[PDB]
Amino acid sequence: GIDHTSKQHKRSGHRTAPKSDNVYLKLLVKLYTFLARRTDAPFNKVVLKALFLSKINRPPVSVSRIARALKQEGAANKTVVVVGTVTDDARIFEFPKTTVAALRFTAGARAKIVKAGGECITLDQLAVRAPKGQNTLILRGPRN
Amino acid sequence: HLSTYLKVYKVGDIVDIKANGSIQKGMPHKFYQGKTGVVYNVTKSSVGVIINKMVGNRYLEKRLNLRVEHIKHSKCRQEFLERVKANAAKRAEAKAVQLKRQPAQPRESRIVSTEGNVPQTLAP
Amino acid sequence: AHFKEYQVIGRRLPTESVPEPKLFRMRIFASNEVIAKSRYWYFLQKLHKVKKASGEIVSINQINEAHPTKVKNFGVWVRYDSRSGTHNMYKEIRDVSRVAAVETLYQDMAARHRARFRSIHILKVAEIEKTADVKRQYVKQFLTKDLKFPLPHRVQKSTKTFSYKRPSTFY
Amino acid sequence: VLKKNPLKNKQVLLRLNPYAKVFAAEKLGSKKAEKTGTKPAAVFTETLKHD
Amino acid sequence: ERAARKAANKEKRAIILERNAAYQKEYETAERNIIQAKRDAKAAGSYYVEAQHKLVFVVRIKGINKIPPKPRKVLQLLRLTRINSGTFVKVTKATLELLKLIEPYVAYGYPSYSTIRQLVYKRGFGKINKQRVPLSDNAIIEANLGKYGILSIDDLIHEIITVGPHFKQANNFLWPFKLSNPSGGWGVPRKFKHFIQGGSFGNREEFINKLVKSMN
RNA sequence: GCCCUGAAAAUGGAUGGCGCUCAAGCGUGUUACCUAUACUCUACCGUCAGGGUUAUGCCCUGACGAGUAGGCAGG
RNA sequence: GUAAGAAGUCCUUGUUUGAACGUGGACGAAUGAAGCUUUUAGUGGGCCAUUUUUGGUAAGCAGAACUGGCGAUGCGGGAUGAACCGAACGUAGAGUUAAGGUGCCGGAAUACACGCUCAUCAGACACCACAAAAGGUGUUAG
Numbered sequence: 001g002i003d004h005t006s007k008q009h010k011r012s013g014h015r016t017a018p019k020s021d022n023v024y025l026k027l028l029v030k031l032y033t034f035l036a037r038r039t040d041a042p043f044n045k046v047v048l049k050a051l052f053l054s055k056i057n058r059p060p061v062s063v064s065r066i067a068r069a070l071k072q073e074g075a076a077n078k079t080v081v082v083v084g085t086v087t088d089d090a091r092i093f094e095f096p097k098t099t100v101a102a103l104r105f106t107a108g109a110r111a112k113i114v115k116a117g118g119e120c121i122t123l124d125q126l127a128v129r130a131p132k133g134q135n136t137l138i139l140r141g142p143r144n
Numbered sequence: 145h146l147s148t149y150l151k152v153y154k155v156g157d158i159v160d161i162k163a164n165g166s167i168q169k170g171m172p173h174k175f176y177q178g179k180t181g182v183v184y185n186v187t188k189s190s191v192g193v194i195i196n197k198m199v200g201n202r203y204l205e206k207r208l209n210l211r212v213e214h215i216k217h218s219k220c221r222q223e224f225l226e227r228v229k230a231n232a233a234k235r236a237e238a239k240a241v242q243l244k245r246q247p248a249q250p251r252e253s254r255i256v257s258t259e260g261n262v263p264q265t266l267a268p
Numbered sequence: 269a270h271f272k273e274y275q276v277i278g279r280r281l282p283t284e285s286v287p288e289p290k291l292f293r294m295r296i297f298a299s300n301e302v303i304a305k306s307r308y309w310y311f312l313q314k315l316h317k318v319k320k321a322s323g324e325i326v327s328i329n330q331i332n333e334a335h336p337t338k339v340k341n342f343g344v345w346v347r348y349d350s351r352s353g354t355h356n357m358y359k360e361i362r363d364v365s366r367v368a369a370v371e372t373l374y375q376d377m378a379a380r381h382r383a384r385f386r387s388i389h390i391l392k393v394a395e396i397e398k399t400a401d402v403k404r405q406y407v408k409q410f411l412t413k414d415l416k417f418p419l420p421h422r423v424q425k426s427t428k429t430f431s432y433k434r435p436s437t438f439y
Numbered sequence: 440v441l442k443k444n445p446l447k448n449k450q451v452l453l454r455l456n457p458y459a460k461v462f463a464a465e466k467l468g469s470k471k472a473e474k475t476g477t478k479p480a481a482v483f484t485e486t487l488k489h490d
Numbered sequence: 491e492r493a494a495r496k497a498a499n500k501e502k503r504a505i506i507l508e509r510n511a512a513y514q515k516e517y518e519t520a521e522r523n524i525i526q527a528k529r530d531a532k533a534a535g536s537y538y539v540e541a542q543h544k545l546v547f548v549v550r551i552k553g554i555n556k557i558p559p560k561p562r563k564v565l566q567l568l569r570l571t572r573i574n575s576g577t578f579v580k581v582t583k584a585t586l587e588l589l590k591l592i593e594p595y596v597a598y599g600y601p602s603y604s605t606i607r608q609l610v611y612k613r614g615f616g617k618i619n620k621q622r623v624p625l626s627d628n629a630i631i632e633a634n635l636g637k638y639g640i641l642s643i644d645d646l647i648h649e650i651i652t653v654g655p656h657f658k659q660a661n662n663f664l665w666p667f668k669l670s671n672p673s674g675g676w677g678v679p680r681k682f683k684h685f686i687q688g689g690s691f692g693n694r695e696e697f698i699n700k701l702v703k704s705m706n
Numbered sequence: 707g708c709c710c711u712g713a714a715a716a717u718g719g720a721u722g723g724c725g726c727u728c729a730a731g732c733g734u735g736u737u738a739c740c741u742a743u744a745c746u747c748u749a750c751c752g753u754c755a756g757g758g759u760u761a762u763g764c765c766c767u768g769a770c771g772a773g774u775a776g777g778c779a780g781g
Numbered sequence: 782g783u784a785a786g787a788a789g790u791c792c793u794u795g796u797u798u799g800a801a802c803g804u805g806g807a808c809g810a811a812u813g814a815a816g817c818u819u820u821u822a823g824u825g826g827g828c829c830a831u832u833u834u835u836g837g838u839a840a841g842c843a844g845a846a847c848u849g850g851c852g853a854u855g856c857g858g859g860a861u862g863a864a865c866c867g868a869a870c871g872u873a874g875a876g877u878u879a880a881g882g883u884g885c886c887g888g889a890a891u892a893c894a895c896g897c898u899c900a901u902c903a904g905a906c907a908c909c910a911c912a913a914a915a916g917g918u919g920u921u922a923g
Binding site for chain 7: 552553554555556557558559564566567568569573574579580582583584585588658662670671672673674675676679680681682704705
């Protein structure tokens, strides 16, 4: 016998893969597994961890929250990033000309961004633009 | 005991609670006896003391006021401060070590002599 | 096991106020140095106020017999705290060495009294130089002039199971 | 893939501890000691033998 | 490039051999000087006491069932998790109290250089983050404990036996030794008495070398 | 210290049985020996962890494996 | 109970004869190896053992306080046995052992050594645990 101390055969949790069955999302995690493994940048590991999350833990993030983030000092021209979904907001009337990348945009939010002048981009295009996450600003939605 | 009144207690100092029977006023705290707490504020008549009291399995924080007659200066940190100052001196001397503490080590080799002390043999 | 005699000395640890304390010595019969030192401290705790942490041993040594082929008549004092207050015993053993005398003594006590190593205390083993100081009759039996005696029953150890001889025990 | 043991297999012994070669040359375990004749004390032999 | 690799290897190897020769000289002159000190005291009629042992080797003797909680925890602390597993420990008051607590369940003593060398050579396994890696090469030690200047298995043996500044780190790098039961046997019929009472446990102070050489 | 007695019934009966008397009994000591799913070494199965790699996969390394009520997963 | 340091030590002067805050400069016993929610099964006054302690009498014992184990647990030994000794389990092989044992049943010395003992149903773990307090011209050593 050994007189164990650590409750052998632990599983460690941590969601090594997503529960989803979306093949495109699986392409995305297949790409970011390569990137986070070979780059050494921490941004890619963050994004890969976020891709496994559920709908409950991927809340939507608003245009107004993005504009708040861009009102920060020395953070106007950064490429903002929401792994989840991006919603419109009719409470704000003035919107910047920023670049933003996300899985899913709504029609109204995409229209607002395009109207202000910027562009709406996917995560793979964000990868071929900025692999290490250089000049990026990640955002997250209110959980509760 | 008049020396229990010419005793400055500044915020930060650590003191034990030991309430004497000779003063009926402010006899505190049945089990706050031989328990140590630092002082947070002081008024006349008065000193503040805080103690970490455990309930369940968490230490909550109880602040209190006591008469000066019951409290007493703690000699808890005497060797701590002495060792800190000696460590500063030894670090200066090094800059010019094992300043850390160490338990009792095994005593080393030596020689015992027989000049007038011949060994005395005996039995039960 | 086969015992040995060990000289042991103890120093009880110096202090300020008292450098070089008095170096008490003892003779022990025991298998090895560990048991010898335990017995040393066991007797020293009884005699004086010392402790294995409060004292130290100076020089463990062995004592070999000066003449381990010369036959000798030993007299042994023994005592054992049983059942009453302690009471003593004098025995005589004809042997070559103090080690053999002590070994056969321990065996004889275990046989004849059911008294054990833990129970027994050795006071003094002493060779008797002169005849006529030998008191016990079973040792007096063997000091007579031109002693002879037979061994009338011989029984021979047999290596085999079967024998074809109707064996004989003669001499 | 397989643990090979020193104290056998002089090759893996010599992979480590290359002092072993000259150790075995000078032999350094059957090594003789410088002789001396420091006799002991009368008090020592006395207190050993008795009293 | 391969020549550069071989050059670095040759440099480190020469360093190892001079270090090991130095250690051999140290050990022999130390023991010889202790012997001559004993002889000098004897000639002058004085007595010489050797330094109290500072290292001990400990071996587990009892299984896991019906062990009380305090010795169970102390054995966990000393990494004696199973029967016949063993470790070196540095002896001070703090450790002597532990040994007093776990005396019924362990046999310990003062080890020799020969048995330390045999253990570290035959059953020497190391920890590289984890995992009980076999040593098998001086590079595995020069990686991890080259921080402390221990470039070789013999340097590690030296830091062990001569108890050094980094004995703690070297001993924790050393996985607990996994030993078998002795080939000649335990001697005594019944184990669970003291070494003095015809048992096996407790301190025996020199015969642990014999025991671990039978068990390894 | 050992031995005898030192009271206990009723189917035939048990130091486990045979039987043992300088013992095959009592006490003690020295060795050798038998022997477990225990310890050591190796292989294989599975789980867990750590690494590597254009693929809920492939490779390397190591530690572990009791189980009722009951829970989870793969089939 | 508290303490065993970088949320700590030591220089720098504005606000009640001085305290607190603030400005900036120099620097520690041993051994061993995360936290946060969320949610629901089964069990929620059962049995055994040790040692602490109160009360106890024909004898036993009754109450509380830890701890360990069985319950859920197979393996070797005790001739057999839920809670005694050892030791905890993947499938196999080789070696070494534990506890217990080596006249035959039965694998292993009718081994070695020192003594004692003869029982008209000896003994073959004891327990000033019961018969119990002694008796005996049986024996041995003091």
